[model samples]
Target: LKCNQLIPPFYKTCAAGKNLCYKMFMVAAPKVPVKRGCIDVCPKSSLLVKYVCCNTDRCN
Candidate 1:
């Protein structure tokens, strides 16, 4: 999948992954909201941070 990649102020397009896209939220940070990309697998969510995964193209 081609996902939207974001690291702080920078924006990018992610390379294709194994049919999954991911978005990570840094709940501990006040300024930086999230980081997005493609992932082959999705990890478990946590208190200080969270992970979201989807299968559609550019789902992240």
Candidate 2:
């Protein structure tokens, strides 16, 4: 899979991996840094943080 890796400011890239692509959103702090990347497993979602996963290229 090809995931979209994103960071704060001006960080972005396409990361190739064999796992799923994930997007992490922090609900506790909207301005806080969230991120996207490829992972073998995604953490369980909660009220403070949310998660999204996909399997396609640049899915995150």
Candidate 3:
């Protein structure tokens, strides 16, 4: 039981610049959190789900 066992470590770059933030997560069994998919570029509504984000480097 550790942090990595919970939320794995991942890094990446942004699509447009070096400031935008990116996130990846999924809802599955054993409460296992998953990291997948790129940042959504289309959205003007509220997001109701579970997830995580890259503060800068991963989202840069």
Candidate 4:
């Protein structure tokens, strides 16, 4: 991704039924290796193959 491009927001809903918007955004690099399992297990057919790496070490 380009440096001028806007980063997509990462969010998740908690067990308390609250939508938590993470302060951090998706990285502009490829962190984890793209695996076929990720695509095969995706519930949404509209999910596209995006190579946004996480800024944290845990994601890598």
Q: Pick the candidate with the highest lDDT.
A: 2
Give each model's whole-structure lDDT.
0.69, 0.70, 0.36, 0.25
Worst 10 residues of 2 by lDDT: 8-17
Residues 1-60, model 1: lDDT tens digits: 466666543434445555677778777673564777767789788888888898776666
Q: What is the C-alpha RMSD of each candidate to the true structure, in Å?
A: 3.6, 3.9, 7.7, 11.7
* Candidates ranked by TM-score: 2, 1, 3, 4
After superposition, which runs of candidate 1 have C-alpha atoms over 4 Å from their true positions? Answer: 7-17, 28-32
- What stretches of model 2 exceed 4 Å from their correct place? 7-18, 28-33
Q: Tell me the TM-score of each prediction against the true structure.
A: 0.65, 0.68, 0.30, 0.17
- Candidates sorted on lDDT, descending: 2, 1, 3, 4
lDDT score for candidate 4 against the true structure:
0.25
Considering every candidate listed, which one attains the maximal TM-score? 2
Task: Give the local distance difference test score of model 3.
Answer: 0.36
TM-score of decoy 3:
0.30
Give the per-residue lDDT digits (tens) of candidate 3, residues 1-60.
011222335444334433334333343432544443235442222344455533434332
TM-score of candidate 4 versus the correct structure, residues matched by position: 0.17
Clashes of 1: 0
Relative to the unseen true structure, what is the C-alpha lDDT of residue 49 in candidate 1, on a scale of 0 to 100?
83
Better of 1 and 4 by lDDT: 1
How many clashes in each candidate? 0, 0, 2, 0
